Structure formats: C-alpha cells, structure tokens
Design a protein around this ligand. Sequence first.
Ligand SMILES: Nc1ncnc2c1ncn2[C@@H]1O[C@H](COP(=O)(O)OP(=O)(O)O)[C@@H](O)[C@H]1O
Ligand SMILES: NC(=[NH2+])NCCC[C@H](N)C(=O)O
Ligand SMILES: [Mg+2]
Length: 356
Amino acid sequence: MADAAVIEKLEAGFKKLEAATDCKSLLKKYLTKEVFDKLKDKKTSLGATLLDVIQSGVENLDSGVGIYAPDAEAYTLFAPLFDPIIEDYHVGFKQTDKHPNKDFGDVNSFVNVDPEGKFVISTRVRCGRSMQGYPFNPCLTESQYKEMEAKVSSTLSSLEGELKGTYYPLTGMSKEVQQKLIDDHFLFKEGDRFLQAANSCRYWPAGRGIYHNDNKTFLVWVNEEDHLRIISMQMGGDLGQVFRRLTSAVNEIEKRIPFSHHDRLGFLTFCPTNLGTTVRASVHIKLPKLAANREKLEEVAGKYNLQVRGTRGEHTEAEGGIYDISNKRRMGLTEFQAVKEMQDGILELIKIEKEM
Ligand SMILES: Nc1ncnc2c1ncn2[C@@H]1O[C@H](COP(=O)(O)OP(=O)(O)O)[C@@H](O)[C@H]1O
Ligand SMILES: NC(=[NH2+])NCCC[C@H](N)C(=O)O
Ligand SMILES: [Mg+2]
C-alpha cells in the first residue's frame, strides 16, 4: 500500500499529534498507536492512504475533528478511525448503527422562530451531496472538476419557479462581486487552512462556482468542500418556508443528478461531520445577555446539541453580536429530526435569553 515517503510522513505526523499537548481533536483522541499501526500501511483503489485522511488534522492541531475521506472507500478501509470519530461527533451513532432512510417528514410543522425579529436576522438550511462516480476533493482531477461543473450548471438551468436561476462560475467572476457575495453570507470562502491541508483546493478555481436565484434565497455551491451544497436561506425566521424550499430543491435536483448514498452512512460527504442527513440548519441570531461570554453561550448551546459559529461561518468571530447557531449532529436522526432539533434548541435559547 503506502510507499516509503508516505510512511515516513505518517510516523512523523503520529509523533506530532502525540506531542501536541494543547490538541483536543477527535483525530488525536482516536488515532491510538494500535489503530495507527493497523491502518498506516493501507491504501484505497484510487491510492488514498492514511495520510490523505489525517493530514489536515496533523497540520491544523486546533482542528475539532481533523480527518476527511479522500474517496468513498476510505470510510470503509479506515473505519477503525472514522467509526469512533463519527460516534463521538454525531452523539450516539454507534459502530454498527445504520443511518435512517431519507425522510424530510412533516415540513408543514416548522415555525417562524422569531416573527418580530429582535433575535433572528436570517435562517438557512443546507444539505450536501456527492455525485455518483466521483471521489472527493483530494482525488479529483482537473478534468473531473470541470466535467462535474458542466453537468451541474446544465442541469440546474432547467429548474423553474423559485428555483429558477443562473450559474456563476468562479472562473472569470468579478472580484468585487465575489467578495460581496462572500461578505453577504452567500458564497463560500476561497478555501481555508483546514481544506488546504486536506489537499481539497487543488486546481482552484477550476470547476468551482455558485448557482442562485435572483433574490438569493436558493443557492447551490459547486465544488467547494463537497461536490454540491444545496442551500435555502432568507432574512427573518421562517424556518418553515426555508425548509420547504430546500426540500423542493433537493427533490428536483436528484431527479437530474444521481447522488452517492450509503446504507450505513447515509448521503456521502467529504467530512464525516456532514454525513447522514448532511443537514445544517442555522440562524444568524443576537442573544446579548446569553452571549456575553462566548463560552457560556457555547455551554448552554451544547446542552441542546447546538453548535456556535461566527458571523462569517465556522472559525470566525461574532460580528455585531451575530452568532451562527445550528444543529451539530447530522447522522442517526432523520432530516426532519435534524431541523426539529435545531428549531427546538433555538426556541429554548430565546426563552433563556428572555428570562435571564
Ligand atoms: N442563518 C444564516 N444566515 C445567513 N448566513 C448564514 C447562516 N448560516 C450560515 N451562513 C453563512 O454560510 C456561509 C458558510 O458558513 P460555514 O460555517 O462554512 O457553513 P456551511 O458550509 O455548513 O454552509 C457563511 O458565509 C455564513 O455567513
Ligand atoms: N466544514 C467542516 N467540515 N467543518 C468541520 C471540520 C472542520 C475541520 N476539519 C476541523 O476538524 O475542525
Ligand atoms: Mg463550510
């Protein structure tokens, strides 16, 4: 499997992880010497090694998780490492558990979490999808990036109603518009250090782009972290409308683009945090009393299985006291359950804010 160069780097990375006293990644926690010795010589059919799985967490010691799947096979070949990390992250998703069958459920039941708008600025739900027949970022070729982009853009051009829109490739995109789309919370960052270290930004920006409707309430990211991110968002608190629109989009898109699903893992994605439902439902929310210390808010949010991010996304700070709060877990519960877990948590945090 792994050649001499890769093995040398692996031994060094394992030592670096062990030596990192301030590291608390799931990677460091679960890559025991035993698991390491068991996996270090392995290599997938596409040639992905344990290095291709763990390098981002070796380079970024402050990672929360620290691993990615370079191909679909990696989830299985390196299951002794993925499985306990997946169980830890998704709370209660055990080594022999299977993620439930897709179910958006009772979309109608979701509420406006803040009609007046004293707390919630905007509401967003995204899913991730991988295209059948293509591996994840570290194993994609330039030809594949462009080929996937051509499929996606030509496909989405047939979408109608609220889903009708336009594909905007990053290649040739106005620099001014690109930064404004990022600042306005619509377009992905041009990578980050976690993705860079995973060899996840190769050939940038070939094959990368964003589809969106004119009012930017429905968007599709092409070839960022995942092949597709399918996104519904709007100002205000109407989680019901947001999720209704996302569900319609997902249903229409899969009629046109075959997606990778796994009997145990659900829908496949590049990071193990995004498997299963792949759902991240979030609000941009102001909670001035509760969020005086980010730590106290994080404690309280954690009790409801919520995750706190900054205004520009993960690894950013809250600007003007606007926090991104979302369901943390995505596996071992249905799409409906994931959004309901977010909704129930947000309502609880608003009650807490009001009462303290
Ligand atoms: N409720 C929300 N309203 C507006 N923008 C949001 C919301 N949630 C996330 N975002 C935006 O999503 C973008 C991606 O952030 P990130 O943390 O990388 O999440 P993901 O990749 O899961 O979409 C950022 O531009 C961020 O500002
Ligand atoms: N975009 C994501 N997949 N975020 C979750 C993992 C991010 C990064 N690899 C870490 O371990 O902290
Ligand atoms: Mg992201």
